[model samples]
Target: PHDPSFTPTQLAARAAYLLRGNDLGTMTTAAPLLYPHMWSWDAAFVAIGLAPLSVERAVVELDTLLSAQWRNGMIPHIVFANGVDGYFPGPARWATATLADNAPRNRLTSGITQPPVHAIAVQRILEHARTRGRSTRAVAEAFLDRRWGDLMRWHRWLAECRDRNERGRITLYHGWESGMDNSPRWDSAYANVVPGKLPEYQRADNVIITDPSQRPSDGEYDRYLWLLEEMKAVRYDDERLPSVMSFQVEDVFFSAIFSVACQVLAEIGEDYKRPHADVKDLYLWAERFRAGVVETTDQRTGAARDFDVLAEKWLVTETAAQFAPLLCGGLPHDRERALLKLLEGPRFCGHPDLKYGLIPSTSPVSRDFRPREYWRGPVWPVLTWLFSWCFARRGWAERARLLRQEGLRQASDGSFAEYYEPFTGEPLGSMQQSWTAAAVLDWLG
Candidate 1:
């Protein structure tokens, strides 16, 4: 093979492994089934790894996925086909059996959705088609059109409905909406949960782990569940675009994604010149969004932060907030800036061997840290890949190459068992995650 590390045989085997274990169900923005699934964004990430193997299967995934786009253009996080149990925040919690029954609840009773990352995924698939020797013209044009249309329409819906004329910023009603699961940033938003206001819904997450520390803690999960129940009880519709309490004025990861979407709009808008006005506005919005992200500095350590800039600034460092910016590919100008800041500051760049991501559940920093788990201190292959890709993109080729080489070494040394420990580099999560394996394929490529 022209590419030395091109392990097609291993890649194919790993790809098949991930495909078989896919636990497809409705995804909600809250834990324990807090919302109906139909979430377009998460499905997008899952599709990225899938596209390399089967474009048709990838297309089908999104095709069946987006069928739940509401008449109002709002894609629910969860899309249920038949009623099923063990998924919390379903129609049962929402008391939407009548409405949800008429709608699709799935036999498993899963529902809810998350952010819209579909167009991004579609665009990526088309990019890969060219090299994969697949037909791209038909799929490319069709997908670009849909990607542009749905994304713009979806953002417009948020602008008009969710943001309530408040432009350039988005407030997630639930933590799961942030897509960075169990982040302590949700404390204020989840505080709105009124005990006993909704039905005493049974939780389904307990089936996964009994230990609170193993996943989302009991109190956190309960609060997460409570928020959804509240939204359901009020029958919260975006019709009026209610006035919302902005908890974290600046969330870098969220804004970074928003900025990327805007960048796409700017590119797509040049074709039709129709949304030219939106492009201009979005560009300016991106600047402001970026400014807000930079403004969120760590008070104790004087470093630029990720996630939310919580009011509890005293306890802020107690949280691991670096993973978001690194994963999102928004590494503040260049890798040097980030590297310098992390090395100079605490709560980041302080670990031995420069631990990239923190284990929020198990780390001593906060009760929120998930120790040794995927998002916690584990050296996630995908994030490491993203970090390397960012460095390379930002003209740090040597650093990028070093990072990539380090990642391959980590994988070779058992970190590929799953999400590996950042310090010692030991696997933790599922034995063989497709995304993790995909990271290896991507690095090798």
Candidate 2:
């Protein structure tokens, strides 16, 4: 196999070009076909990636996503682009505007929400603003104050609605909320989700990628669609969801992210004299979820695991998500060292067959690992960038640098793919994936 490599300068320029192409005026979609709308977490990363290019564009892209936040304060997963229904379970299929009273009247969006990565993106955008000039940074600073209430409400919604019966681990209504999609982390929880008729849905994802192996299987889609139907049946009422939706799980990764986002928001509050809420309030929230993440640690591996809320059991999957504690910063020093060793060990990034040292979505040695599948075991540059971003923040400078270097090398093929095969380095799923480009730009910039 021939290895193709691009210089840092060359890769950054192409990444910038791809991000520009993904720009949809008010919002930046994830890709041309695989995702044609503003995905919650993808939009967050896109804004962070676009910050260096244009702070104003980055603000608008993220603003468009937040603008569609439901009246109840839950940010919907997919904010539909005007008149683009090519994607199955498109805005019409979700019908949030018609069915859910809390959904925005004008915008179409999915009822379920994805991970909350906005605060981290906002932090990056503010950092980029300082590079522009005095005026730019001031405006960006004011932007945070203006939007503080929305961020506060979003966090409160998770605390109130998605809190479920768990003490610290956050409850997710659907597997989509965790954002790993079909990873084996959800397999046990999904098995308990019995579908009622499934409503005969059409899938646009399979149509976009001709290879069936690159996407989640049909049975997976049926469960997803069934969950969608269940949400619609309750008219997206949060209180009623737990009664009907059996796929609830206490997501460790999502919980870790929320804890980190709360910390970011609390840090922002310390700076701004914003009057919306108390700074100490944000601090307590982060501290609480930080404890929640620690509780998910598996005794065997010392890695965080997702908990099935209703099943009252722990999900012990060997996936990159197990490193959630590393992202949130609440682990014991000795245990943290052990996890770092595990991360670099043969089962994960150190796997002998891996084309690059980039972290795979799932442990390659696990039976659940699938090099070509969506979230089973592919190298997602965006995820690599995320873990490195957190690692760098925690002062693990050398480890962060190495991961960043390998992530760039993996994406240097210039495909800007949604993901790459863990061993073959082949681009999979959507080509010109916006977040993948974002990952490269952030690493280089």
Candidate 3:
């Protein structure tokens, strides 16, 4: 059944077709079977994939999510278009209309936010257009001109609301906000959360994904709900967040993605001939974040630990997120070398028994690493795409090629599952995940 004539681009096109088929008017569902709501970061990934095929649709994908942006400029994580009962924490739970000012009157959105990937996605979409030549560039520029202000507002919100200490370092109030829901990175901070007599609700995630271990534990869910209840208590008021929240930590991946976004924003600002001060500030923030990766580390154990912003200590969890600075570049050579050696060694992509060379979300050496669990050790194509892209940028061509091939093979075999088992390459969680399809188009190229 193997066809030597089938190219990587062709395989990627087939994958894109699956994602396109799941599109609802004006927005694309993260997954048709389980996830019907438009997710904040998922739309960014989908927009990047859609840019080459249909630039108009790609713009629409991002605009729809932007439409759900709160008055304070924080984009809600989930926008429920249909309000179906399939997902827990649906519109009924968030009561978004009452809390969020300037959110669309009819639409419901989750109060929390995901990683700030919008600027990065917009930059890539424009890059794709430029690669297509002049006419597309003109169109992309027009789109950027219209959305530029909105993007700037959103970025400012992160600085004003999320950076609790006003140190230019963003903090995530919940693990869900980090977009790596069950990663051990939050183990210590989340442990401090005590869920005392919260509202009893059924977990809709369990209905679709039956395995308890593949998802966050019931105890974790109680704490998740507790955090939601706390936020709900304050009416999701960003200014009151620091006073009310129990869990607040600076996540490596969140800061890394924001740093990359800052870099891209600076590039976009320069291209548009925006004010010099604004662009310079962005560049400074980007450099500060990159330096924070090294400067924020705790070295008591002679190994760098991700600093917990609230606890003011090092989080010793070993997850692939610690390596995210590789994508942003500008790190000191010695720091870069240390990260490269760690990534290429036995803990991550270099693990001898890694199935098809897929990078696990959690390091194999971590006590919390779980191969079949979500965000614990699953091989997510989106993460693999990021790692592969970062590797290729850093001149690790062979490693990039292997990671890209494994992701493509998984897409070809399973039609884009949410994540895959690291050892067996078996698909798990939601089928036809939008981000996985995005990964196929992005990494295949």
Q: Please provide, for model 3 over 161-242, each residue's C-alpha lDDT reduced to its tens digit, 9 standing for 90 to 100.
A: 7765555467888889888888888888988898877998988888889987788888888898899988888888887778
Error of 2 at 209 (Å): 0.6
Residue 270's lDDT within candidate 2 is: 78
Top-scoring candidate (lDDT): 2
Q: How many residue pairs clash in each candidate at the backbone level? A: 47, 0, 0
lDDT of each: 0.50, 0.87, 0.79
lDDT-better candidate, 1 vs 2: 2
Q: Residue by residue across 1-445, what tens digits does model 1's lDDT show? A: 3543424466546545544355353322211132223335545654565666666556656655555555455656655545455556555665543434323343222223355455456655665766665465455456555555655656565445544434344545566665555655555544544456544656665554343433556667666666555555445554311333223333445654555555555555665453667777656655544444445545333343443333434224334344333333334456536534553345443444444433222233445555554354445565556556545645668767876776666665432444666566556554555455556655643
TM-score ranking, best first: 2, 3, 1
The TM-score that candidate 2 achieves is 0.97
Q: Write the per-residue lDDT of candidate 2 for residues 1-445, one digit (tens) a residue.
A: 4767777898999999999987878988889887988899999999989988888888888779889999989999999999886788887778788889999887888999988899999989988898889888877877786687898888888877887543766888888888899988999999998898766677888898989999988888889888888889999998898888878888889989988988887887776665536567777878888899988886655699898877988899999999999998888888888888899999998999999997899999999988899889999888899899989989999999999988888887899999999988899999999999998888777
Model 2 residue 121 lDDT score: 93
Estimated TM-score for each candidate: 0.73, 0.97, 0.93
Error of 2 at 27 (Å): 0.5
In candidate 2, stretches whose alpha carbon ends up further than 4 angstroms from where it belongs are 1-3, 164-166
Worst 10 contiguous positions by lDDT, candidate 2? 270-279
Model 3, residue 35: C-alpha shift (Å): 1.5
